[PDB]
Every structure is written in structure tokens, then in C-alpha cells.
Write an enzyme that holds these catalytic residues in place. Structure first.
Site, short mmCIF file in Angstrom:
data_model
loop_
_atom_site.label_atom_id
_atom_site.label_comp_id
_atom_site.label_asym_id
_atom_site.label_seq_id
_atom_site.Cartn_x
_atom_site.Cartn_y
_atom_site.Cartn_z
N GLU A 166 0.92 -1.10 -0.36
CA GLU A 166 0.01 -0.31 -0.11
C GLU A 166 1.01 1.74 0.05
O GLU A 166 -0.01 2.68 -0.64
CB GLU A 166 -0.96 0.08 1.34
CG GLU A 166 -2.09 -1.38 0.95
CD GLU A 166 -3.36 -1.23 0.20
OE1 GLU A 166 -3.41 -0.11 -0.79
OE2 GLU A 166 -3.88 -2.00 0.69
N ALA A 167 2.05 0.87 0.45
CA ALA A 167 2.84 2.26 0.66
C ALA A 167 3.43 2.63 -0.67
O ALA A 167 3.84 4.24 -1.16
CB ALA A 167 3.46 2.24 1.43
#
Ligand SMILES: [Cl-]
Ligand SMILES: [Cl-]
Ligand SMILES: [Cl-]
Lengths: 240, 6, 238, 6
Positions: A166-167
Site C-alpha cells: 500500500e505504501a
């Protein structure tokens, strides 16, 4: 197969790890760029393609046996490898990911957030992530065996998927989380806005290639007032 | 060398 | 603009309306077909293309024939609704790229997301009831609507019409569970809700389906091709 | 003519 390291030693090593991955698997959009910062589109690979992410630097002052297998076309975590036992624990919705040279354990559990949050008894909104809890997540995954995810294994996956996949997708999550890697080890608390971003990645991926010029774009409740808002938030999108 | 949004 | 009618007169006219639309806006997948039933992929049109859906057959008799939905083709998203009696296009705030000629366009402050609609409607989709009567009630709410801010009853109306048009076009399961109401109440199940929230992920996986083993997308499991065809009718084109 | 899944 491609192989990357995500090095958690410092804020600097973590950000440069994420940027090296982005440069290798994606191509900048012409119309969403400012300086060296861009929104990038994942490069097309054959279906079933994956790359490995090696986790390092969890302890600045060891813990080097965790590898994540990531499906390239959608940046989804298909499972985790214990490199000490050479065992790939694969989620039930990723039976098309075939990794040679490892023992594959097909798990009964799927990768969805609904499933993982149920087994983990943990909601992502308000979830805390610190350096000590990533070391703790590493140890749960190295201790794991069998074909059914446990509470501790599912918490570990929720935390590692947030700070890796997700980063990678969302510069906003990278920027908010990297503070936890500094020398006083503050806590990253995931916000409702972070969670909403992750739930809308597909729709965001569909609209950004059509963005032209300047000014705003809206996808449901997600509102970007200008290209800087976009770049501050989104780093990598699906290729549709 | 990082970017200003990182 | 391209134009389709969804005729709610009977179960038969409703199903045949949806099938006609699907045949025109999508193309069957070769590997997911049995008899005349297939999973189809939305035809790729230029960005911003849309079509109109005219609502007909809601009750007896001329009546209740002034509602038109505007649907963006590539994602089957409802961009808003047209009151053809007042010639007014009420457009969601996330669809300012949808341009409809010859109508008065009201740009609304409200977006089209389920989270926004349910909040304004004070109604959760899981357990929501849809009957012929609740579609007529929804129609009456949309025709009475004006201004640029969505109200509770207009938001309830959009929730119900989106379910029985766009979501039914996507999911044969929803079409089959609702159509009895046109002959009983349809009650949207958590399972139905979970389908609609995973349409993109489902669309990404099905074109890779070969032969006939299972398919798993998150918590959504299809044991066989019959389970697929019973559930999904139209998928995104990626 | 409808299909059996309709
Ligand atoms: Cl805008
Ligand atoms: Cl009529
Ligand atoms: Cl989805």
C-alpha cells in the site's frame, strides 16, 4: 524473476527502497508529473507474473528471513516465504502464482481485508504500526506453519501489506509511515482516509490516465484539488 | 536524492 | 446519444431489456459460456462515452415515463438522472466529464459513491428492500427533486434504481433475485452487497479462467462455470 | 427465449 529489498533501517533507506521498485515496475504518466515526482502506471507483464521483496533493516542496531511474493500486475501480496525453511505460504486466491524451487503451502485463508481483519480481530482504521510491531510481525511469520492463518499471522500480514504494497501505491501512506522509522520510533496510526485510499485504488487507477492540464478530479468521496494533491497522495496505479 | 512529496 | 429502454412491465420484459442492453454494450467471453448464457466484457469506447437508459413499465397505463438514467459505458457508472419533463440533468459531482447536449445540467454537490448515498439516505444497502412499489416511490421522489443538493428520498431512489439497472446488468445473481418483485419483496443480502463491492477484482480475474476448475476472488468463491454464469453477467474491460 | 441462469 525480479527481486527487490525494502530496507527499514532509516527513513532514507525505506523511501529509496520504494522508489527503486517504482522505477523498475512502472512508467511515469506524462500529464501527472512535477520535478522527478510522478504518478506511474505498472508496466504490462504476462498474467501470473510476480516479483519478490526481501525485508531488511528491521533492527538498526538479523531478522533477514522474510520474503514477500507480489503479483506484479496488481501489486497484490500473494503470500510470504520463510527463507530459512524455504516455504511459500500462499493465499487461497493466488493459486495461479507458481514459484519454483520453494515448498508451496496452499492456505485455506484468502487475502482480502475482510478475512484478515476477522482472523486478526483488528480493524485497519486506527491500526498502529511501529518498528517494534514490524519486528513482532516478522517473528509471527517466521514462527508460522500449517495451512490456516492465525490471529498473529494475520496481524503481521495486515501490517506488512500496509507498509510495502500500500505504501508502494500511495505516497500518502509512505510519507505518513516513514516517521515511525526514526530514532525515537513514533507510532504510525492508520487513518480512515488512508483506509479509503486503499479501498479506491482501482477507481483511482481508472480516472488518472484521463487527467489533463491542471485543477481537480473527483472519484467518489476522494477529491484532488490540483496535481500537487494527486502527487502527494498517489504514486503507482493499475494499467487498464 | 528524494522528491518533495516523499 | 445511444438509447436503451428498461421495461419493468413484467419479469419477462425486464429480463429481455437487460439482455438486449448486454448484447449491445458487451461481447461474450469464449471460455465462460454455456448455451446462450455467457460472461461478457464491456466493449471499449472512447473515454467519457455514455448511454441513456429510459425507465418504462413501472405501473399500469402513459404514466411514470419521464425518468432517464445516464450511464458511463466503460464502468457502467450512473452519472446522474434526467427529468425529461423539465429537461434537467442532475449530475453527480464526480461526473463533470459527462456532457449531455440539449439538457439543462445541474452540477450537484453530492458524489455518486455508496458511502455518500447511504449516509444521505439514512439507509444501508445490506437488508434494503426493493419492490415494484418501492421503484414507483423512487421514481416519484426523483421527479419531485430539484436543486443541486441530494435529499434523503432522492438518495434512496438512486440506491434502488442503481441496484436494479447497473448492478443487475453486471450481476445475473441480482437480476434473478430481483425480477420476482415484478410479477414479493427483494431484500439485498450481504452476499449481494459483497458482489457489487468486488466487481473490479472479479473483472480482473475471469478473463484468465480456462477450462473448468474453481475461481477465488477474496471471499468470493466460484466452484464451477455454472456458479460463475449464475452470478456474473458483465465485467470491466482491462 | 431466456437462459436457465436468468
Ligand atoms: Cl473536479
Ligand atoms: Cl410507461
Ligand atoms: Cl473491486
Amino acid at each position: 524473476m525480479r527481486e527487490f529489498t525494502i530496507d527499514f533501517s532509516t527513513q532514507q533507506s525505506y523511501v529509496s527502497s520504494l522508489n527503486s521498485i517504482r522505477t523498475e515496475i512502472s512508467t511515469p504518466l506524462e500529464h501527472i508529473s512535477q520535478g522527478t515526482t510522478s504518478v506511474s502506471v505498472i508496466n504490462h507483464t504476462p498474467p501470473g507474473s510476480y516479483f519478490a521483496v526481501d525485508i531488511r533493516g528491521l533492527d538498526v542496531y538479523r531478522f533477514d528471513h522474510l520474503r514477500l511474493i507480489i503479483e506484479q500486475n496488481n501489486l497484490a501480496v500473494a503470500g510470504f516465504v520463510n527463507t530459512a525453511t524455504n516455504t511459500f505460504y500462499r493465499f487461497s486466491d493466488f493459486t495461479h502464482i507458481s514459484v519454483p524451487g520453494v515448498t508451496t503451502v496452499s492456505m485455506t485463508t484468502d487475502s482480502s481485508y475482510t478475512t484478515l481483519q476477522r482472523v486478526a480481530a483488528l480493524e485497519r482504521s486506527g491500526m498502529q504500526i511501529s518498528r517494534h510491531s514490524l519486528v513482532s510481525s516478522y517473528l509471527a511469520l517466521m514462527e508460522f506453519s500449517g495451512n490456516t492463518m492465525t490471529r498473529d499471522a494475520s496481524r503481521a500480514v495486515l501490517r506488512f501489506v500496509t507498509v510495502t504494497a500500500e505504501a508502494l501505491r500511495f505516497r500518502q501512506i509512505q510519507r505518513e509511515f516513514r516517521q515511525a522509522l526514526s530514532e525515537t520510533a513514533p507510532v504510525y496510526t492508520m487513518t480512515p482516509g488512508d483506509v479509503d485510499l486503499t479501498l479506491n485504488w482501482g477507481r483511482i487507477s481508472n480516472v488518472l490516465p484521463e487527467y489533463r492540464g491542471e485543477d481537480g478530479v473527483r472519484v467518489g468521496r476522494i477529491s484532488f484539488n490540483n496535481i500537487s494533491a494527486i502527487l502527494g497522495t498517489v504514486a503507482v496505479i493499475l494499467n487498464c | 536524492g528524494f522528491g518533495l512529496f516523499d
